[PDB]
Coordinates of C-alpha atoms and ligand atoms in Angstrom, one line a residue:
X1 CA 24.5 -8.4 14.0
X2 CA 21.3 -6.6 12.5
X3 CA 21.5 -5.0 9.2
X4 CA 19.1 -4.1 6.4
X5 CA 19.4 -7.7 5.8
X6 CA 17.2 -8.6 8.9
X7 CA 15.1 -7.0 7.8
X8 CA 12.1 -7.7 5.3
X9 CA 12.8 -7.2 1.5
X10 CA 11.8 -4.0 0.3
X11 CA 11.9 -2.6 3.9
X12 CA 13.0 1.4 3.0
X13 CA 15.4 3.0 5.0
X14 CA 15.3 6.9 4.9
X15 CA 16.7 9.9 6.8
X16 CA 13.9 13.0 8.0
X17 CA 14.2 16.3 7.4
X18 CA 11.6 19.8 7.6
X19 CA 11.6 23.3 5.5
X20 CA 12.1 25.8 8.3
X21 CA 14.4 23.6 10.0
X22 CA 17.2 22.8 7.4
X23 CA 16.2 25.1 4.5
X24 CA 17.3 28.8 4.7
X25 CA 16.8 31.2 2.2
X26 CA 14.0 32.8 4.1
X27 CA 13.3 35.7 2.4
X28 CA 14.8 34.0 -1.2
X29 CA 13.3 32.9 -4.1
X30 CA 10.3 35.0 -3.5
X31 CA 9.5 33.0 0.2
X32 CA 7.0 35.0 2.6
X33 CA 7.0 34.7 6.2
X34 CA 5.7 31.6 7.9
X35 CA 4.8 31.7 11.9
X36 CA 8.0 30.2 12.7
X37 CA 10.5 33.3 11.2
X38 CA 7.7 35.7 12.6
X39 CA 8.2 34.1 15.9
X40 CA 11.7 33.7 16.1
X41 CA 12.4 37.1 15.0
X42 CA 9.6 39.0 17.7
X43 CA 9.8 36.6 20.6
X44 CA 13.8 35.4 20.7
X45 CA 13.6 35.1 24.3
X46 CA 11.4 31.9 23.7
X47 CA 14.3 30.8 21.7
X48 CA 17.1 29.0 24.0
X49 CA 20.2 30.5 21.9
X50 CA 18.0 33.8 20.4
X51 CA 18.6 32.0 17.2
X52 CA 16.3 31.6 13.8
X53 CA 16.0 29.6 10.6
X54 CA 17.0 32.6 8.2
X55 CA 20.0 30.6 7.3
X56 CA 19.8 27.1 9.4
X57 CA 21.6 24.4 7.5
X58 CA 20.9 26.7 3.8
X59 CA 20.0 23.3 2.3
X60 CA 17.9 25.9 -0.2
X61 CA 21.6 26.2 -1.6
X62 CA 23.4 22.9 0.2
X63 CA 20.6 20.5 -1.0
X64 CA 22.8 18.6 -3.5
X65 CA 25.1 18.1 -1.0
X66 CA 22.3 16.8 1.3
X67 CA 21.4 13.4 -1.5
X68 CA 25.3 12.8 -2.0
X69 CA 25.3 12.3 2.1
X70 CA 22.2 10.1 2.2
X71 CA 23.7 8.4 -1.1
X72 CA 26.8 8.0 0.7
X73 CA 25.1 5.9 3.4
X74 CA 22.8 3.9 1.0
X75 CA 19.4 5.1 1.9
X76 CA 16.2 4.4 -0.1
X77 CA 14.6 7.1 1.2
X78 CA 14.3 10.5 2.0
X79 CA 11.4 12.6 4.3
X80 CA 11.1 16.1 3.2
X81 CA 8.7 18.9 3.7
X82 CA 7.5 21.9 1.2
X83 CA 7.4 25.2 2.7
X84 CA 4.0 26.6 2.0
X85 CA 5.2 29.7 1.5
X86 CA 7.6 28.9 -0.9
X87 CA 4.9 28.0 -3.1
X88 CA 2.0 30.4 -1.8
X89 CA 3.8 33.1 -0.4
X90 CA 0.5 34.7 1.4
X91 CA -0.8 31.2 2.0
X92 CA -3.7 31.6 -0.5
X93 CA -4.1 30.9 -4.5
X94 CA -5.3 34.3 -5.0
X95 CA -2.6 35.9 -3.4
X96 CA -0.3 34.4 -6.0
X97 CA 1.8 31.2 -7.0
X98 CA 5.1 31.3 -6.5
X99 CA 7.2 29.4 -9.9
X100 CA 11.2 29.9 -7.5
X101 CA 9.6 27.9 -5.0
X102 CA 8.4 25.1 -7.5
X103 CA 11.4 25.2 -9.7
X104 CA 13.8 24.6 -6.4
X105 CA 11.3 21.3 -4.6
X106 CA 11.5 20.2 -8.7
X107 CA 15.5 20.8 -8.6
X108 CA 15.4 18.8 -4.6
X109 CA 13.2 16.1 -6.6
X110 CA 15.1 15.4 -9.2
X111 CA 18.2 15.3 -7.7
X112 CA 16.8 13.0 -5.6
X113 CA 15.5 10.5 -7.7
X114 CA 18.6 10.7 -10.2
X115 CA 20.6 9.3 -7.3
X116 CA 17.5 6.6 -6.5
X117 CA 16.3 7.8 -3.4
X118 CA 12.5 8.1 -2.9
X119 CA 11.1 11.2 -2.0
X120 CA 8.4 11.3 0.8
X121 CA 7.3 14.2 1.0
X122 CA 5.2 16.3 4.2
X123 CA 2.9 19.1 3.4
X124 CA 2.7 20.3 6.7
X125 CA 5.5 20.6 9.0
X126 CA 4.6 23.8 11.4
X127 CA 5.7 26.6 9.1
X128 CA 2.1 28.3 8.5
X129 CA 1.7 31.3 6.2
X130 CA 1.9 34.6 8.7
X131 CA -0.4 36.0 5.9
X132 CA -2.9 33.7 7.0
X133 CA -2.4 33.9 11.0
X134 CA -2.8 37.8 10.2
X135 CA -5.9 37.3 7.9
X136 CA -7.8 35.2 9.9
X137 CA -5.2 33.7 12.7
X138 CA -4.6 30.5 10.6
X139 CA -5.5 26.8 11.8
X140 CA -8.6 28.7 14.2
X141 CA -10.5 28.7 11.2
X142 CA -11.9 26.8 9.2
X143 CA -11.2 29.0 6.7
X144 CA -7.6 27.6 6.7
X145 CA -8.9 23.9 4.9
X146 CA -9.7 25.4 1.2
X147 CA -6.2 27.5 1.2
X148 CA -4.5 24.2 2.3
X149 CA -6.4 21.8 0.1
X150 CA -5.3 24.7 -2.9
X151 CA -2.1 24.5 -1.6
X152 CA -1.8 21.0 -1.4
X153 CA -3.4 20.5 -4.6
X154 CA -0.2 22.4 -6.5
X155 CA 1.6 20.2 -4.9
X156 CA 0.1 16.9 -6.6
X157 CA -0.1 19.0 -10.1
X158 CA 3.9 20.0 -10.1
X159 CA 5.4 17.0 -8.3
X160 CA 3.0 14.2 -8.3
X161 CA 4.4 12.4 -11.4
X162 CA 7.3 11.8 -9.9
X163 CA 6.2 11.7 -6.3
X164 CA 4.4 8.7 -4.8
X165 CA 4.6 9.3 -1.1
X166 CA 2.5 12.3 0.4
X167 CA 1.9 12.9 3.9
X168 CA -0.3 15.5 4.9
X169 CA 0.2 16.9 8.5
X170 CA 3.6 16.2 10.9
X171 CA 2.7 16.0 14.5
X172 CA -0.5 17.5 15.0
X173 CA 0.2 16.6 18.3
X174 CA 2.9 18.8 19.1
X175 CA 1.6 21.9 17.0
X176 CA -1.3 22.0 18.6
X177 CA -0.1 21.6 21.9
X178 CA 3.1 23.7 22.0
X179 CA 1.4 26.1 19.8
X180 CA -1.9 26.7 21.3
X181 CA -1.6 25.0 24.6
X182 CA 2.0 25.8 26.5
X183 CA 2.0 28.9 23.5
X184 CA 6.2 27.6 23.9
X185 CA 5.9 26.9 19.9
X186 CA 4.7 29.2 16.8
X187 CA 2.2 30.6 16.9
X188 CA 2.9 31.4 20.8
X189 CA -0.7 31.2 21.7
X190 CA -1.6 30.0 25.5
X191 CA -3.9 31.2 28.5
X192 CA -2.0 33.7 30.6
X193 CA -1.3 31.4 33.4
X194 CA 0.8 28.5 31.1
X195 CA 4.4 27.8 30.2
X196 CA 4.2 30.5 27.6
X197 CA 3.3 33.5 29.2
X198 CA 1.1 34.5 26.1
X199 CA -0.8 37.6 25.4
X200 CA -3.2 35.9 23.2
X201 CA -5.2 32.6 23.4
X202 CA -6.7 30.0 25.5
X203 CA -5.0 26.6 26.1
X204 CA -8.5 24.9 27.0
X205 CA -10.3 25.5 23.8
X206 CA -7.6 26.3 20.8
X207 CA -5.0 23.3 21.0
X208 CA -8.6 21.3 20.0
X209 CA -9.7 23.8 17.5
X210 CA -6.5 24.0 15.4
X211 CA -6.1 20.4 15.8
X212 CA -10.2 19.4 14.6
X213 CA -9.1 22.0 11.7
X214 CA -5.6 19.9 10.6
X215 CA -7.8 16.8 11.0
X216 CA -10.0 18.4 8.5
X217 CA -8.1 19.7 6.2
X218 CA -6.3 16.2 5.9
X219 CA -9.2 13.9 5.8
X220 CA -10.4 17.0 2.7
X221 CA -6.7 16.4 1.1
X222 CA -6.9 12.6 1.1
X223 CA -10.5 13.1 -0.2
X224 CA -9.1 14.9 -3.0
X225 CA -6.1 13.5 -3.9
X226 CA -8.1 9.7 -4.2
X227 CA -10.4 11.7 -6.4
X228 CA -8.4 13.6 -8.7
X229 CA -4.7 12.4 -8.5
X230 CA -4.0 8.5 -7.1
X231 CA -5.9 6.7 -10.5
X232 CA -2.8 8.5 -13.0
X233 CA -0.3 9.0 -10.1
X234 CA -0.7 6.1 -8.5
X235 CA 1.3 7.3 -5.0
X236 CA 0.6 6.6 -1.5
X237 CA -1.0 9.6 1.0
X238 CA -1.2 9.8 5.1
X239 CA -0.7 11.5 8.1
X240 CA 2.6 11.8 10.6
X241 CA 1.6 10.9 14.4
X242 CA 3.8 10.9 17.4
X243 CA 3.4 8.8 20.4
X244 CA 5.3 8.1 24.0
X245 CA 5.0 5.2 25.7
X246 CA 3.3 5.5 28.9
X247 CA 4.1 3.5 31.6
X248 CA 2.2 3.3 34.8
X249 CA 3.9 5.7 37.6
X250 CA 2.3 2.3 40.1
X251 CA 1.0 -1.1 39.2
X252 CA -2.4 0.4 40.8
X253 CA -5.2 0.2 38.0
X254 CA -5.6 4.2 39.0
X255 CA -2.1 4.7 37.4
X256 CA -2.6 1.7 34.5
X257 CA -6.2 4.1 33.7
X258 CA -4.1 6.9 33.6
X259 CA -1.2 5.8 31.1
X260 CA -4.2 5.0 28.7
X261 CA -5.6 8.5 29.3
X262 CA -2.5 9.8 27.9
X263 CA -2.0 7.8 25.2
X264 CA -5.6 8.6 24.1
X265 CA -5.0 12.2 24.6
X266 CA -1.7 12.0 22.5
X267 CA -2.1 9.6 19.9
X268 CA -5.8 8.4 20.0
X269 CA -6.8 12.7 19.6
X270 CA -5.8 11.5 15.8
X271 CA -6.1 7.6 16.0
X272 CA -9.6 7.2 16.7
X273 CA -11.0 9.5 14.6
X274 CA -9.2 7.9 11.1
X275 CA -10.1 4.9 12.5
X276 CA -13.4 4.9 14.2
X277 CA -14.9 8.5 13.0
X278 CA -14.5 10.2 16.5
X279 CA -12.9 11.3 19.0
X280 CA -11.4 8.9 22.1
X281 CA -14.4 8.6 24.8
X282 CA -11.9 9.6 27.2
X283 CA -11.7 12.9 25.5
X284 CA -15.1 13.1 24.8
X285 CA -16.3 13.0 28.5
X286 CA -13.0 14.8 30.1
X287 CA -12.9 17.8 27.8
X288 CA -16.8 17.9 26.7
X289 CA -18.2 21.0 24.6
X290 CA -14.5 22.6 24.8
X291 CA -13.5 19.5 22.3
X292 CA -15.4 19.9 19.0
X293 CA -18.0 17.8 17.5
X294 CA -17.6 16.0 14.4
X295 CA -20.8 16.1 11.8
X296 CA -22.1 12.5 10.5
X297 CA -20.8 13.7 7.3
X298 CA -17.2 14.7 8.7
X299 CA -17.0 11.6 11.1
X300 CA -17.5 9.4 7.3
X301 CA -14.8 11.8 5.6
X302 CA -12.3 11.4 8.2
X303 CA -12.6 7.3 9.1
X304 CA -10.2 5.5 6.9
X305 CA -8.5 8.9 5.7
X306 CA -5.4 7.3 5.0
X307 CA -2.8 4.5 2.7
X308 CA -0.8 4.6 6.3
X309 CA 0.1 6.1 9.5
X310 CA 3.6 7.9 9.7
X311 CA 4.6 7.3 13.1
X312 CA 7.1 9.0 15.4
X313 CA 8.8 7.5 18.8
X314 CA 11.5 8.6 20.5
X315 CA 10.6 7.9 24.5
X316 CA 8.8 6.8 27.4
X317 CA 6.7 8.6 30.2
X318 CA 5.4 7.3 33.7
X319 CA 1.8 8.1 34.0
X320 CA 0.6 9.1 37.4
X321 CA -3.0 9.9 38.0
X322 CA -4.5 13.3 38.6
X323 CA -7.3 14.3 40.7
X324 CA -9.2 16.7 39.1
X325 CA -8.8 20.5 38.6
X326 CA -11.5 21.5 38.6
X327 CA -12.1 24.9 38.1
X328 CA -10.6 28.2 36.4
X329 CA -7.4 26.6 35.0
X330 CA -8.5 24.9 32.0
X331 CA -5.9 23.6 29.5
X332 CA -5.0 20.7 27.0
X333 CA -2.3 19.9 29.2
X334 CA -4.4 18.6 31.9
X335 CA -7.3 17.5 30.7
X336 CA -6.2 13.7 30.4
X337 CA -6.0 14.0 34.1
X338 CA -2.7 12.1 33.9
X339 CA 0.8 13.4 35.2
X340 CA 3.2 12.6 32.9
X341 CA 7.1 12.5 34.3
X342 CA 10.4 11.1 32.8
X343 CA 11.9 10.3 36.7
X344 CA 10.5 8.3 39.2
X345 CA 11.5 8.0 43.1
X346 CA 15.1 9.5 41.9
X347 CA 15.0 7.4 39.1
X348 CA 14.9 8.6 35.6
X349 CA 12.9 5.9 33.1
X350 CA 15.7 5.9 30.9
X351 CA 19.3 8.0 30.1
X352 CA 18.5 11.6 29.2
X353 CA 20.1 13.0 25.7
X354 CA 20.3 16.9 25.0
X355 CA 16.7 17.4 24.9
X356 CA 15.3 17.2 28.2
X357 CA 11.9 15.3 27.4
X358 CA 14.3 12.8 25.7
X359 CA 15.0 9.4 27.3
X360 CA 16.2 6.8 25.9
X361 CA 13.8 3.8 26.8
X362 CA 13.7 1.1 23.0
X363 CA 11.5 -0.9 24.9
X364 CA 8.3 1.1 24.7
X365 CA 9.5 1.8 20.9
X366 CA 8.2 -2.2 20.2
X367 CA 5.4 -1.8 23.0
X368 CA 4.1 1.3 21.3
X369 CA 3.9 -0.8 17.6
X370 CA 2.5 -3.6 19.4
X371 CA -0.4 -1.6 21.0
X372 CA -1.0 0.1 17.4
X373 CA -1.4 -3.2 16.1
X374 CA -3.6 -4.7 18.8
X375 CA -6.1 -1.7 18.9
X376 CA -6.2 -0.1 16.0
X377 CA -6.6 -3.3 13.0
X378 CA -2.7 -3.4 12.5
X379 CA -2.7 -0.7 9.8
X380 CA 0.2 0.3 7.4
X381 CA 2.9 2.1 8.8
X382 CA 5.7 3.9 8.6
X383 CA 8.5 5.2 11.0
X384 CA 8.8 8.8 9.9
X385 CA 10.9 10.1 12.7
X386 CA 12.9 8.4 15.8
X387 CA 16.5 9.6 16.8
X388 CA 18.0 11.7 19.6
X389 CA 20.7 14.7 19.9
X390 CA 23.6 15.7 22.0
X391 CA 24.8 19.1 23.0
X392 CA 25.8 21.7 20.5
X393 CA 29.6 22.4 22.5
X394 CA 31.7 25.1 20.9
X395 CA 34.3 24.1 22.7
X396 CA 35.0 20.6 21.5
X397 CA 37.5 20.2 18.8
X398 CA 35.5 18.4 15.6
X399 CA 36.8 15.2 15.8
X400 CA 35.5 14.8 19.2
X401 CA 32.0 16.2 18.1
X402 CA 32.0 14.0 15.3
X403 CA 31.9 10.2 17.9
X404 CA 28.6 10.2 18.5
X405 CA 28.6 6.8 19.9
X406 CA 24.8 7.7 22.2
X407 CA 23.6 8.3 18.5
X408 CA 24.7 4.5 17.3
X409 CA 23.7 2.9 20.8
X410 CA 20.4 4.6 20.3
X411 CA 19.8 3.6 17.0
X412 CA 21.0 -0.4 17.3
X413 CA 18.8 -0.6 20.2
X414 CA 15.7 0.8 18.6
X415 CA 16.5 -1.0 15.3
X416 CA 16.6 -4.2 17.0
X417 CA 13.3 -2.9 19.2
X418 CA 11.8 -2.1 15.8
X419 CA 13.0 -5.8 14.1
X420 CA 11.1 -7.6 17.2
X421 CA 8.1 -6.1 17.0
X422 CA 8.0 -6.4 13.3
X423 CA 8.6 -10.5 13.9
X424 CA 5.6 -10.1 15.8
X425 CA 3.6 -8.6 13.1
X426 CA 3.9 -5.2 13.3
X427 CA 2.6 -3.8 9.8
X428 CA 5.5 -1.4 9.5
X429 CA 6.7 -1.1 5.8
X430 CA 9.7 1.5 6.5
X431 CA 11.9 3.8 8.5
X432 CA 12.9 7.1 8.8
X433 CA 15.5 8.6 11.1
X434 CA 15.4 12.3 12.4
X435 CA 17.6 13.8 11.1
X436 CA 20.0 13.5 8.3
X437 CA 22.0 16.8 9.0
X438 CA 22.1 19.1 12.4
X439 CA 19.0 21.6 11.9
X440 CA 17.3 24.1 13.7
X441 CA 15.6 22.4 16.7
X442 CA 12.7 25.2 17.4
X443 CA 12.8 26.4 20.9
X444 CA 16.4 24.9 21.6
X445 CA 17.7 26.5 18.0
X446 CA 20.9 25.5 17.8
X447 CA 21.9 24.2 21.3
X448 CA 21.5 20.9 20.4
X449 CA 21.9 18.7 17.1
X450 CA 19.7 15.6 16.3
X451 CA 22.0 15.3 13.0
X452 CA 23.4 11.8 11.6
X453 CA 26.1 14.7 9.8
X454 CA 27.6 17.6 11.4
X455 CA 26.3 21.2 10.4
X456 CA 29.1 23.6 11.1
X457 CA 27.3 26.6 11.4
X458 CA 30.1 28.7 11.7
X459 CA 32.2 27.6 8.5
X460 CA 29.7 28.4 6.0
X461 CA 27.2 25.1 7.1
X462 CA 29.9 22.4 6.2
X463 CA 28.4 18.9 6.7
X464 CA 31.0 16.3 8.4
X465 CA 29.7 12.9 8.5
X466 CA 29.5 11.9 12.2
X467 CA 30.5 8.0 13.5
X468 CA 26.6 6.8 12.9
X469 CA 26.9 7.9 9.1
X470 CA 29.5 5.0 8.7
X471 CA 27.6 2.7 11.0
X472 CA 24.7 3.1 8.8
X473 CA 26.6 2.9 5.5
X474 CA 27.6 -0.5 7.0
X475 CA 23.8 -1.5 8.4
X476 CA 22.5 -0.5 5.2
X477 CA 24.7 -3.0 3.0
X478 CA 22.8 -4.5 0.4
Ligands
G2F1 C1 10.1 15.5 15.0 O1 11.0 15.6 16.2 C2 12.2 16.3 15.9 C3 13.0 16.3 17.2 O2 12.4 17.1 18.2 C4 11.9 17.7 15.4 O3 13.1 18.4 15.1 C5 11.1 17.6 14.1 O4 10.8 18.8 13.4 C6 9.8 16.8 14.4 F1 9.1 16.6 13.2
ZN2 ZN1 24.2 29.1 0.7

């Protein structure tokens, strides 16, 4: 059966985790408000339970608990992100730097590394400094760059002597588009007429802008951390993308076009331009003056930006074409002109978990790895999130919450997905799941837990390893 032992040596195993979602201690240590608590605590209606991080699994406090878990299970690894403001509580350098918020990522760090887990740390995952979407509403400026090129640089000056794994951004993909597009994320920006119902923004033009700004900003970090940090440091920076697989609704070429229009509006939005200095052409021509324009000298900054590409899967779509709009209607959601659905004639592509964009389809897991390889020169990669979650059920007595046997099935099969494409040549050097403990899950708060341990919430955020826990103890022998 396949263990870390199938695997190639030196292969890491890890366990993913983000700030808002497991810290806590929101207004502690001398944190300011990100876009995340500001949403959560003025629009709770776009919150499935009404629910916030101000407590969420209070790793702030739990955190040593957290690395005797991952220990526990014999991970290498562990992905981590740094709240920005718990280091710059309003975002900037000027506005102050915040020595609680260094002292407790130095405390996580060291704890970390005295059991012999790696930290990986991301820069960016979604909680933005409300100072800064007040000042000068955040990532639709460019403004936003220096203060997280400061922000980052802190970073590499307090923990880069011990940290040797940096990635940048998490999912531009899904900030940008739940943020600025559907406006279902933080910052809740979207045109009138989308998902969110928003009284701000404009889902044709700002999902691109906040996204050509994150591209920036990273390609600018990179830039700088090559130039001032990596020759005494010597640690690894990159970016965290996430993918579906798309397959064709029809064996037509129409819906074959199509499935490649949404991968290039997904994945290649942030592929392309770290690999071949632009956007895709199919964004390019669908989109047109709405997408921005990179400068000669900003298409040579951001085209090889990278050590590797963090990569996230965790399902498949059917792509159907679209005729076009073509009109008034305008927004990042359409524009690939490809209808993207999990069920086809009855039939859903594969069983749903808890969230409901979740199906469980390992196949495109090795066909997404594969394409990355075949079109993009095979570069170095890690998986930096893939899992899935059931139902949070109050009702369930804990030993029955605990057998979380869709968790191991999920994991074997994309393990063994993973494994086969790697046999092919896959460049992928490690592998991360999401998530090590139940968290908050954004919109869906606490209705449903992606967690490898159980988080009870109500008995002061106990942790309860669940089956998978001792399935990867045993997977992760030797
Ligand atoms: C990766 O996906 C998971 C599951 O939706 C999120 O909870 C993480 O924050 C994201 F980075
Ligand atoms: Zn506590």
């Amino acid at each position: 059966p396949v263990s870390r032992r199938s695997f190639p040596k030196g292969f890491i195993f890890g366990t993913a985790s983000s700030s808002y979602q497991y810290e806590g201690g929101a207004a502690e240590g001398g944190r300011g408000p990100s876009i995340w608590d500001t949403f959560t605590h003025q629009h709770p209606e776009k919150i499935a339970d009404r629910s916030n991080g101000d407590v969420a699994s209070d790793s702030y406090h739990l955190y040593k608990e957290d690395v005797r878990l991952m220990k526990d299970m014999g991970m290498d690894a562990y992905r981590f992100s740094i709240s920005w403001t718990r280091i710059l509580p309003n975002g900037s350098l000027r506005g102050g730097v915040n020595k609680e918020g260094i002292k407790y990522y130095n405390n996580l760090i060291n704890e970390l590394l005295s059991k012999g887990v790696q930290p990986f740390i991301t820069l960016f995952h979604w909680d933005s400094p409300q100072a800064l979407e007040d000042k000068y509403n955040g990532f639709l400026s460019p403004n936003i760059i220096n203060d997280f090129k400061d922000y980052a640089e802190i970073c590499f000056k307090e923990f880069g002597d011990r940290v040797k794994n940096w990635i940048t951004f998490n999912e531009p993909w899904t900030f940008c588009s739940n943020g600025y597009a559907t406006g279902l994320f933080a910052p809740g920006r979207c045109s009138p007429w989308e998902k969110g119902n928003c009284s701000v923004g404009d889902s044709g033009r700002e999902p691109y802008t906040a996204c050509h700004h994150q591209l920036l900003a990273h390609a600018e970090t990179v830039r700088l951390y090559k130039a001032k940090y990596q020759a005494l440091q010597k640690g690894k920076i990159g970016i965290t993308l996430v993918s579906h697989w798309f397959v064709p609704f029809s064996r037509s070429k129409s819906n074959n076009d199509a499935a490649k229009r949404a991968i290039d509006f997904m994945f290649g939005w942030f592929m392309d331009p770290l690999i071949r200095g632009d956007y895709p052409l199919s964004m390019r021509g669908l989109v047109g003056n709405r997408l921005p324009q990179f400068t000669k000298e900003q298409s040579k900054l951001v085209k090889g930006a990278f050590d590797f590409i963090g990569l996230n899967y965790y399902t498949a779509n059917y792509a159907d074409n679209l005729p076009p709009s073509n009109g008034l209607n305008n927004s990042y959601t359409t524009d690939s002109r490809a209808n993207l659905t999990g069920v086809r004639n009855g039939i859903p592509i594969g069983p749903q978990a808890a969230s409901p964009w979740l199906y469980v389809y390992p196949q495109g897991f090795r066909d997404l790895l594969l394409y990355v390889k075949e079109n993009y020169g095979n570069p170095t990669v890690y998986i930096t999130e893939n899992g899935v979650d059931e139902f949070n059920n109050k009702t369930l007595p804990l030993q029955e919450a605990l057998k979380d046997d869709a968790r191991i099935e999920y994991y074997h099969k994309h393990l063994l997905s993973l494994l086969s494409a790697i046999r092919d040549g896959a460049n992928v050097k490690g592998y991360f799941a999401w998530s090590l403990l139940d968290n908050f899950e954004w919109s869906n708060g606490y209705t449903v837990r992606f967690g490898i341990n159980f988080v009870d919430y109500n008995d002061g955020r106990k942790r309860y390893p669940k089956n998978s826990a001792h399935w990867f103890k045993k997977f992760l022998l030797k």
